[PDB]
Write a protein that binds this ligand. Structure first.
Ligand SMILES: O=c1ccn([C@@H]2O[C@H](COP(=O)(O)OP(=O)(O)O)[C@@H](O)[C@H]2O)c(=O)[nH]1
Ligand SMILES: CC(=O)N[C@@H]1[C@@H](O)[C@H](O)[C@@H](CO)O[C@H]1O
Ligand SMILES: OC[C@H]1O[C@H](O)[C@@H](O)[C@@H](O)[C@@H]1O
Ligand SMILES: OC[C@H]1O[C@H](O)[C@@H](O)[C@@H](O)[C@@H]1O
Length: 509
């Protein structure tokens, strides 16, 4: 039985009216419905969407179980976290439009019931939910393991995913050690090439008459602070004052930390928030929270984003929030994606403590022409293409990307495979490590092994050019885009990517 694209949302609304928790998600969908429907039709017109098998898909939202104790549903409308719920909403909508057979679960009862009656070919779950899956199913949970796609915002690096290696390194993460293929982890932003980038869609309501008259609509000296709760505002006053010299400063806050001059609007409904963004020249980052959606929404509406620079980068080594996350990734700014893949004039990444630099950025932004912008990968059509490619082409059970995409590179000592790929405008592709892990295979890529040994280490395969000595991976679950060798070179698998669609190679569709 073959999937048919859907262009009507009534079945979806009915499925989401089954739990109150889904209420917030259901409303965002309704606001974005016409965009979604334009996008599935446009994709079907550009690319052949026929001949897809209709999948039975479990979607288990562990974060919405009582049993998790997360209280996300509870605070959804009153200024709590929404990033995750944005992502889930967009994933469900995508699956529905592509014509799959979605069974949504927010409870142990439903999880048990859907798995109970068989058929399931694909499972979207979070880490909290994955623990529940293992516990509910007992030992046969491993039978489903290759169908798992695990929503994990900040990402999982190989050294935390391999249970035995993580313990040999003393890592106490409660989040790691599932022993999956790390490409099964689905992230919020393309920051972890050991994982896959899932993302979400950036909500925007600018017609092309809004964009032509955007200069009438936007008040040139209006800034808005990013930061829904009071805590995030501690010790920002110098920064805010420099901004307040040039611009009014507005906030949407659910207050001891906020100066008297700030103009508060409270927490706004999605529509009202979108209008406030459309009238705003400058969205002001305070440092927290890390890697959320809100800055991209502002950029889509023509705001510049002032992005706090982190020198040293923040990570588990230096920031409590990061301790125990199953990754050693370092953030160079509040929103590294915004910093690296968007940049000026939309994104000004600045040292909050450099008054001169802050002042120059504010005066610059004040003087910039308004240019609303969205990377393609965060549109409806671009997210549909990405997830459609993943469902049709990612298989961890029984060759994608195809070998023709492989471009081998040598990281220097002190540089990771992530880095050397990125420096040549490529991205690391962990599925190709298996093709560069033997004497023969090396010769090809213009490195000669005068002696090899095996090792079980994330930093290998490695090459010493002085000694012509090669080390190969002994444990194939330890292949790792993350990690730099302190003294040797790494042999690194890179691939190309489509403009504005970093998850997909040119030949991947
Ligand atoms: O007054 C507000 C402020 C924010 N948001 C939304 O809350 C979401 C979460 O954005 P943020 O980057 O703050 O991430 P979080 O930390 O909540 O995951 C975004 O879609 C914002 O538009 C909202 O609905 N009303
Ligand atoms: C709301 C939610 O579950 N979000 C994230 C999750 O995606 C991530 O896997 C985990 C570990 O870093 O931290 C939390
Ligand atoms: O991870 C989601 C959520 O988990 C905890 O249980 C809560 O107390 C929150 O502070 C946190 O954000
Ligand atoms: O985003 C909500 C909250 O979920 C939990 C943890 O992921 C935190 O790291 C995060 O802030």
């Amino acid at each position: 039985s073959l999937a048919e694209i859907r262009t009507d949302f009534n079945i979806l609304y009915s499925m989401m009216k089954k739990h109150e928790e889904f209420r917030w998600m259901r409303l965002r969908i309704r606001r974005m419905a016409d965009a979604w429907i334009q996008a599935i039709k446009s994709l079907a017109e550009k690319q052949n969407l026929e001949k897809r098998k209709r999948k039975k898909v479990l979607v288990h939202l562990g974060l919405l179980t009582k049993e998790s104790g997360f209280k996300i549903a509870e605070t959804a409308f009153s200024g709590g976290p929404l990033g995750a719920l944005v992502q889930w909403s967009d994933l469900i909508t995508s699956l529905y439009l592509l014509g799959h057979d979605i069974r949504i679960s927010a409870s142990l009862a439903e999880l048990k019931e859907i798995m109970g009656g068989g058929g399931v070919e694909l499972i979207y779950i979070d880490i909290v939910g994955l623990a529940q899956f293992k516990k509910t199913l007992g030992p046969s949970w491993v039978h489903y393991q290759c169908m798992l796609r695990v929503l994990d915002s900040f990402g999982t690096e190989p050294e935390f995913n391999h249970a035995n290696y993580a313990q040999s390194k003393g890592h106490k993460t409660p989040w790691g050690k599932w022993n999956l293929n790390p490409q099964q982890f689905y992230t919020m932003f393309p920051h972890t090439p050991d994982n896959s980038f899932l993302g979400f869609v950036v909500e925007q309501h600018l017609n092309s008459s809004d964009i032509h008259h955007i200069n009438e609509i936007k008040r040139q000296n209006q800034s808005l602070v990013y930061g829904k709760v009071d805590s995030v505002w501690k010790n920002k006053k110098i920064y805010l004052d420099i901004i307040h010299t040039y611009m009014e400063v507005h906030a949407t806050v659910y207050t001891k930390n906020i100066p008297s001059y700030v103009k508060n609007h409270g927490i706004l409904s999605g529509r009202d928030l979108q209008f406030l963004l459309r009238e705003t020249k400058l969205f002001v980052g305070l440092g927290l929270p890390y890697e959320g959606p809100a800055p991209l929404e502002a950029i889509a509406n023509g705001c510049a984003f002032l992005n706090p620079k982190f020198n040293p980068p923040k990570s588990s080594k230096n920031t409590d929030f990061f301790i125990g996350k199953p990754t050693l990734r370092e953030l160079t700014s509040q929103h590294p994606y915004a910093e690296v893949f968007i940049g000026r004039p939309h994104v000004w990444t600045v040292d909050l403590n450099n008054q001169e630099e802050v002042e120059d950025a504010v005066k610059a932004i004040l003087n910039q022409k308004i240019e609303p912008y969205m990377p393609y990968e965060f549109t409806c059509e671009g997210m549909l293409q990405r997830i459609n490619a993943f469902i049709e082409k990612q298989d961890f059970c029984h060759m994608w990307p195809p070998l023709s995409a492989l471009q081998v590179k040598l990281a220097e000592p002190g540089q990771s495979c992530k880095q050397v790929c990125q420096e040549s405008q490529l991205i690391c592709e962990p599925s190709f490590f298996q093709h560069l892990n033997k004497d023969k295979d090396m010769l090809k890529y213009k490195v000669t092994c005068q002696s090899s040994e095996l090792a079980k280490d994330i930093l290998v395969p490695s090459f010493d050019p002085k000694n012509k000595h090669c080390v190969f991976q002994g444990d194939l679950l330890l292949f790792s885009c993350a990690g730099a060798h302190p003294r040797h070179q790494r042999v690194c698998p890179c691939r190309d990517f489509i403009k504005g669609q970093v998850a997909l190679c040119k030949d991947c569709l």
